[PDB]
Amino acid sequence: SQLDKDAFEVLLANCADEPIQFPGAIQPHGLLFTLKEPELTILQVSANVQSVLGKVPDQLAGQTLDCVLGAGWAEVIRSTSANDSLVDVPRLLMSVEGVEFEALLHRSQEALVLELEIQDKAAQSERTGNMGRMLRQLHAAADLQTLYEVSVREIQRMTGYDRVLIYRFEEEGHGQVIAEASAPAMELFNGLFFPASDIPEQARELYRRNWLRIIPDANYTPVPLVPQLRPDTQQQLDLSFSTLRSVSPIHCQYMKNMGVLSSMSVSLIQGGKLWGLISCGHRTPLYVSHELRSACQAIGQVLSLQISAMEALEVSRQRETKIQTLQQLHQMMATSDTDVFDGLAQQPQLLMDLVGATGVAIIEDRQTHCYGNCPEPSDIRALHTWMMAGGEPVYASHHLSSVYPPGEAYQTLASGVLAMSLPKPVDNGVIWFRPEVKQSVQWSLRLQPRTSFEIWKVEMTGIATKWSHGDVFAANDLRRSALENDLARQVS
Amino acid sequence: SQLDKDAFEVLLANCADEPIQFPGAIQPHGLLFTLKEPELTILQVSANVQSVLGKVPDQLAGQTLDCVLGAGWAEVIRSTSANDSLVDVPRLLMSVEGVEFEALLHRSQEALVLELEIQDKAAQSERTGNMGRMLRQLHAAADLQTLYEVSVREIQRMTGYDRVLIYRFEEEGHGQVIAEASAPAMELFNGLFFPASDIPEQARELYRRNWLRIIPDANYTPVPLVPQLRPDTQQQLDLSFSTLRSVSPIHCQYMKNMGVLSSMSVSLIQGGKLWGLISCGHRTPLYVSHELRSACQAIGQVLSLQISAMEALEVSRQRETKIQTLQQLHQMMATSDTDVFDGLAQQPQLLMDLVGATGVAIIEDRQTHCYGNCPEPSDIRALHTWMMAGGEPVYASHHLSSVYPPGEAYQTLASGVLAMSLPKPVDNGVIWFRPEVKQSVQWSLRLQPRTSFEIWKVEMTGIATKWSHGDVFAANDLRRSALENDLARQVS
Ligand SMILES: *C/C=C1/C(=C/c2[nH]c(/C=C3[NH+]=C(/C=C4/NC(=O)C(C=C)=C4C)C(C)=C\3CCC(=O)O)c(CCC(=O)O)c2C)NC(=O)[C@H]1C
Ligand SMILES: *C/C=C1/C(=C/c2[nH]c(/C=C3[NH+]=C(/C=C4/NC(=O)C(C=C)=C4C)C(C)=C\3CCC(=O)O)c(CCC(=O)O)c2C)NC(=O)[C@H]1C
Incomplete structure (x- = not known):
């Protein structure tokens, strides 16, 4: 593939300015619909809606939702999207033509973006009791390093990922792997520093706006959005808040060179700033259900509160000695x-x-x-x-x-x-x-x-x-x- | 009851030194057994083991556990108490003579204290999705006061208690109701200060050592422990870590004068110090299952981390202005x-x-x-x-x-x-x-x-x-x- 390799190197030269919020494609583990808020009209549909539900996407744009999912589920969407701000939405499930779907919803520039994530039966009480165990273990931590080790241990025990790392971002934007919890017979990564150029500004902003980022398969064919531009605004769809968002080929190549095919990152945000990341990697493709998404989402929110709490206490503890040392020196x-x-x-x-x-x-x-x-x-x-x-x-x-x-x-x-x-x-x-x-x-x-x-x-x-x-x-x-x-x- | 009223006033005169860690009695919603670690011999049994399982407690002391619960459950206890530190124990359930029991275990002075909490069928997925909602709402809080209001709102929505209050303990030990979430047609309690004499030192220490305190019924007859003293140490049993612990009659009278019969307190601990309390009250007797105990236990652990985090940030924010004001004044x-x-x-x-x-x-x-x-x-x-x-x-x-x-x-x-x-x-x-x-x-x-x-x-x-x-x-x-x-x- 000389043509593909030559075109790939064009992206490598310009990676700090590539638009990753408008990839024009979605990952294949789900469908993406754009709906007008009043009438639920189809503006943009994904291209895998032909391999699933067997609907040709060429003429499927411009009709109503009920034509593709059924009248009952269309009315369900009507009800749940009737001026609710789409902040607190329960777990919805659909079954169209014998496939299990989970519905997620948000709003992007006066347009209702609706993601139909495919749930596989093969992938599908203890978690409730596990959360308390994890919270007590995190509360029992005394030092920040011990907190990192117990956090990576607990998150690997939960998810079962072959590798778990915690990255801290320094003052100059560089990254540092401070914690690691990996499976046996795998490369160690503790004490590794990567430059700020590895994570561009757009990726950092998306991580600051999104708590979870899931890539279930590195070797994936991006599914184009048909049409490519939104008919309402004559522009590309803003996918900054969508879970089914295309990954940059540079990062897919980087993950393949690392030996990982499934990735799951939980952003750590303190004071509105990206303190770091919890990166989970797997050698074989892995899919994470909602029951495991919310548990990992709770990890980052609890860890961010605990890290922020223990960082300020150490800040005060370190400089109480500064006052004592200053007063001690003032005597001599x-x-x-x-x-x-x-x-x-x-x-x-x-x-x-x-x-x-x-x-x-x-x-x-x-x-x-x-x-x-x-x-x-x-x-x-x-x-x-x-x-x-x-x-x-x-x-x-x-x-x-x-x-x-x-x-x-x-x-x-x-x-x-x-x-x-x-x-x-x-x-x-x-x-x-x-x-x-x-x-x-x-x-x-x-x-x-x-x-x-x-x-x-x-x-x-x-x-x-x-x-x-x-x-x-x-x-x-x-x-x-x-x-x-x-x-x-x-x-x- | 002139004799009872006269004896009650003796306790009121001496309340700051009354031993509440050794009440010698337990609340009726469960049984309490003391077991020797090697042989699981019965040393102390509760007095309600005659109204439940129909076993006379006079001669029931001094035999093995299998004689009172069955050989299978005795072996189950053997297995779960075989050098496990009793820190991470799953939810155990038993059914002896047609009653549902939940088993809790801890160790008190080389003795295995085992509590058989009665679960009523009348009292007996959404909670998993609720925890994420609560964590996101708590993370969305900007000011400490708003954090208090959202916390009391969420905990009342969960538990359904008729009243929820948050008490903060000041520097002199006094208490202050800073937040309140009560049912309609009930007395308001915000901005009320109670002295440190209301919560004695023993109660404060127990709250510092216990995350949850449950009193399902104020009008309760304490069930004596038979024998009253431990045969091994010739002393009374230390109930400081037991959920089935007798409440002081002073506090029961105080709760009855407040119009509450069921109470549920979650201790808030920061830096090993009792920052405050989350007190939940109900007009009618209420029983809380394990599924609701662990969820409220997670509230106090999350709130304590969040309160500690936002308190130190406000500490730094307030005194950055002090440095600016000091430098500004130094110019004039x-x-x-x-x-x-x-x-x-x-x-x-x-x-x-x-x-x-x-x-x-x-x-x-x-x-x-x-x-x-x-x-x-x-x-x-x-x-x-x-x-x-x-x-x-x-x-x-x-x-x-x-x-x-x-x-x-x-x-x-x-x-x-x-x-x-x-x-x-x-x-x-x-x-x-x-x-x-x-x-x-x-x-x-x-x-x-x-x-x-x-x-x-x-x-x-x-x-x-x-x-x-x-x-x-x-x-x-x-x-x-x-x-x-x-x-x-x-x-x-
Ligand atoms: C100039 C563009 C480049 C680029 C783009 C890019 N990177 C990411 C995500 C990354 N890349 C990371 C790099 C690492 N450095 C290390 O030392 C290690 C491993 C030890 C890694 C993986 C990194 C940590 C992230 C964040 C992942 C996370 O855990 O959240 C993206 C975002 C892609 C997305 O879909 O989110 C982009 C666009 N990578 C480059 O290497 C340079 C050329
Ligand atoms: C000298 C002894 C006394 C005493 C003993 C006692 N109190 C408690 C628990 C209390 N009492 C509280 C008092 C209040 N003050 C108020 O203003 C309000 C209401 C607005 C109350 C309820 C109080 C806040 C607690 C802690 C309860 C909680 O929320 O955790 C105990 C502990 C009993 C137990 O079984 O835990 C004792 C022994 N009470 C007195 O009034 C004086 C005489």
Whole structure:
């Protein structure tokens, strides 16, 4: 297939801007109808409505719903879609010409989109008691890491998927597999970083708007929507809220290279932001019923509330020590020292732990104290002059080479710097050094996880962890603390 | 019943120390057996095992379990209690002599306590779909108050109880009904405060250790345990973890005076502390099956995670404004003012909102600026001298009359004070005033809610809301901010 392979590479070149909200096709495990709200007129029908119910879709567009499903089910749809906002709709079931259908409904641009998901008898009390077990296990978690492990364990026990991973999204948009629960004889993926380019902006927005994303078969033929454009608005149908939505061929190829054919992702949303994802993968095609969809949907909602709760508690817990460390340091700031900055040199370990760093360097006059893993003293000496040329009290930068061109000589040692200085003319100040993030990541050919790691290792060169608000508050508070005793010596 | 009424009043005098973990009796809606772990020997049996299964309890103590329930169910108990920790036990059912039994099991001091709860056929898919509806509704909540209202609405829709209330426990142990969802033609209870004496320490500890407390009938005759003391340890049985536990007669009388006969409380626990309670009440006797117990148990676990998450977010959101207000104030601290404290007088509203207060009073030399709802200037003038006699930088007190005897003259106006002063000799400082909590509470004869309100109104006299850690941090930060520019004027 030279023609197909050549056309495929066109999509690979332009993947960050491809419209995935309007694929024009749906996955084959169901039908999609567009209905006008008053009259339930057929505007767009799927192309698999000929292999199911045996209705030719060419002339099936433009008639009423009762002609394709029966008068009774058409009236049922009339009743359930009569000004209900389609937020709380019970489980509907239909049986047209001997096939089992589940009805889902939503509204997209003054049009009723109705999905008829096929339920197979082969796929078809304990779940009610299971939910309590899971909630108690999640409540019993003390640390965030233990919460991740128990969550992946429980979700794999429920779904039976061969792999379950939890991805966290960092401050720069990159992803990190923090938890993993996989079947035996399968590749391990913990501690793997993929770039933000792997999940485009449209995919991120759809994940933020949709709690569940199900791909029951990677090797699937997309079913076109007939007609391709909506007759009412002369535009393509917005499938952003539909479960039967076509998957991009790039992601299907990526999943096939990962050895998975069935995927099930639960979005994790905190404060309206995508904190991460729960990705479930299976080697063989798998179909998830409604009884398992709602249980996994409840997992993401419970986990998001629990993760948000335990993240803020750790935020407060970490910076209570910052206040204690700041108050503790403020005492040695006036203990038998001609210079204020000579006091913190006695406890270098307490200085680094205040903000979080690997090396600190105290500068005074023509003398530099090098503590911890820090650059050469001639490098720190040269760094200080340019770094206090702007006159800022505390200067923070997690990408030194972006603004300091000679800063690439010590990317491994010091890529993030925190400043502090005083308006007195004599050379002074302390410098914190934060190392590259790549050095703390250890993980064991076009679209593969081993290739996304290489792209992350190139896109995240010379970038340290971003200085937290508490980290810049601790430096700002210590500067005012160092200014108080330094300016008190002005009297004497 | 003069003898009963006289003996009842003895319990009312001593209610804060009555042992409720060892009542020696169980509620009649079930049986209680104590079993030795190896041999399943009967040590303690309930007294209603004669009205059910027709077995005399006098000689029934000291034999094996199979003699009372059958060999098959005895072996079932053997299997399910064979080193399982009794944490994750499925729903067991038995049918002895034509009665339906549900088996619950736990361990109390090297003894297997087994409860045979009676299930009535008269009392005996939608719940699975209901849980998702509830979780989505709870996730859709934006404010804490809206969360409370949606929670009480949903729990009343589920259980059908005639009343549902949410109690929050304050810093001093008092309770407050913050949410209410009641049936028509019933007394309203929102904004009612009951003292900490209403719920003793033992009851609070049991609620912290038990998620659910069910009293299906207030007018119930306690069923004694025969024998009354455990033969193994020569002590009474610890019923702290048993659902079939006797209710104190004081609480039964209190519930009868409230017009409720069936009660169902779900404990709300955050960080291992009892944040509050979800109390459900019914006018007529009601029995809750296991299918409804686990659903309500899931409510408290989800609500506790959500309340804890949204409380910390509001904690951070409130004090981000404190940092902004502190930084904003620090700018006017050096804007054309001979005295540092003369600058904050121009924006009294920004001063009060920094910590949360109703009146502020700026003191300098022989002149006092009275702003907001504050005491008389002669009272503030006299207050300042004693209040800075200790030399503390910032003095906080939510009970002024406890340490300032002449402070009862303005309990309504200023009962909580926040201090700030500088080591300079001239009289200086700002004073924040926080009013009594009783003035902001408006709610429309021995054990009644209208009487617990009176006890709270007496026990909480002259007590303001406790100064938060941010409130004392804002005053401490402004003192250092006021010291910087004041001590900078020492140079010039
Ligand atoms: C520029 C476009 C590209 C692209 C598009 C794309 N990706 C997704 C979904 C992905 N892709 C993920 C990539 C990974 N990186 C890893 O390290 C691993 C495994 C360890 C994976 C799978 C990824 C995590 C997601 C989100 C899935 C989830 O769990 O929710 C989409 C969305 C497709 C959809 O139908 O939802 C698109 C359009 N992928 C590329 O590789 C680049 C070329
Ligand atoms: C000194 C002993 C006393 C006492 C004992 C007692 N109380 C409870 C449980 C209560 N009592 C509550 C009191 C209320 N205050 C109010 O304003 C309202 C109504 C608006 C009530 C009901 C209260 C809230 C609880 C907790 C119930 C819940 O919802 O969980 C117990 C525990 C009994 C048990 O079996 O659990 C005891 C021992 N009550 C008194 O009034 C004083 C004399």
